[PDB]
């Protein structure tokens, strides 16, 4: 029975997890850092051991992983970072709070976006205050023109995450390597969807909690042999 | 020049404060060591340095130094490669002894021999050593052949197992134009400086690298330094 563990980072600075932070590289808030500590301590009290870690290229996920690896005295582990595990790209909405989103686009369009699986929000355009900050970030310079999103539907997000799971993470798990994934709600969502074979309506309802380890036990075909478990209280 | 390389040696560890031999023991930075790294990182930030790949040991006092630097220069997203081959020199049986216990037990003449020689290792870490299993049975070394896992190391041993990693895994990255950062330890960095500068044994044994301070090499396309190593920081530092 393979053992797999996911963790989702906690709160970021300037309330950005409630402002469609997306591909903006918001750091963790102090509270989010503390959550990561607690998730780490939990993994330590339970004596978990990993052999390799996967994360995104966004600092709030990376710091969550650093914090965890610190807590469990495993900062020596190999770490692979990939843009394919980034949070969903929210296009023009990146940085808007809920009221500003409604004011600028109207309630009807917002609802359709909230509930649609393959309707992207509007793309982030060059006068967006995050446009060059994200799309001209060195860390994406190896991405083809069609790989760099200006916006993403949830389906887009999953479609770009799944290839990295297939080609990079599955082979590690199959070799018996205990894997830890520190990433974001919507990239984790694609992994949980493909694991449990969930529906679009189902994955759009799943609300993964932040800062607590998410344990999977999988059979020899990478299928869950029970539901997901949490670690802590 | 064609290429630029940055090295950094970690600062003070918890066992430095106890003046104990660490070697492969995985001692964490002291708070002052952590601040050293923050200043080093800040010096890299103020000079606008950019990297593409990082290499480090599997010892937390180097890894945390690298973490602290990547944080300071806002490049936490960079790929990072960890390897035992960049570990501090293994001090064998002296591991965990402090200065007084070492002097008391072995005397000045024998210690002076050890300090001044290049290919004379200290006594091996025997299985009844108090840190034998904490180090030699630590699972981070499970992939090592019985020949690779040292019981003790001369400086020549440490450089001999460091240089293969620099030839096989760092040189290709450099010749590929990747801007490299190595965060490691005094004696593994000694291997690299010895190789880059063609220094003699006598010279390398006399070389003490500053800690928590960015060490900058300007290399030509053959990886030959074109000037002496430079340091980044304020006038005093
Ligand atoms: O003034 C003196 O009489 C004098 C005496 C000694 C001395 C005395 C008793 C001993 F048992 C030994 Cl081993 C050395 C040392 C120095 N200074 S030193 O040569 O630079 C020197 C510093 C430190 C270490 C050391 C470090 C770590 C572990 C073990 C030894 C060895 C040498 C003296 O000026
Ligand atoms: O850098 C070098 O190449 C170097 C290497 C050695 C050395 C090497 C192998 C050995 F087996 C022994 Cl026993 C010593 C010694 C000195 N000089 S020293 O004065 O003797 C000296 C020794 C040890 C400490 C120390 C001990 C514990 C914690 C923190 C510091 C300080 C000072 C060197 O400059
Ligand atoms: Cl890392």
Molecular structure report:
The structure is a homodimer. With 233 residues, chain A is α/β, with parallel strands linked by helices. The first copy, chain A, has a single domain, classed as 3-Layer(aba) Sandwich (Rossmann fold). Chain A is built from eight helices and six strands; from the N terminus they run βαβαβααααβααββ. Chain A has a six-stranded mixed sheet. The radius of gyration of chain A is 17 Å and the shape is globular. In chain A, 41% of the residues are buried. Chain A binds chain B through residues 25, 49, 57-59, 62-63, 66, 73, 75-81, 138-139, and chain B through 26, 50, 58-60, 63-64, 67, 74, 76-82, 139-140. One ligand Q9R is lined by residues 99, 102-103, 107-108, 111 of chain B. Chain A: The modification N6-acetyllysine is found at residue 104. Chain A: Catalyzes the interconversion of 2-phosphoglycerate and 3-phosphoglyceratea crucial step in glycolysis, by using 2,3-bisphosphoglycerate. Also catalyzes the interconversion of (2R)-2,3-bisphosphoglycerate and (2R)-3-phospho-glyceroyl phosphate. Chain A: The modification Phosphotyrosine is found at residue 24. Chain A: Homodimer.
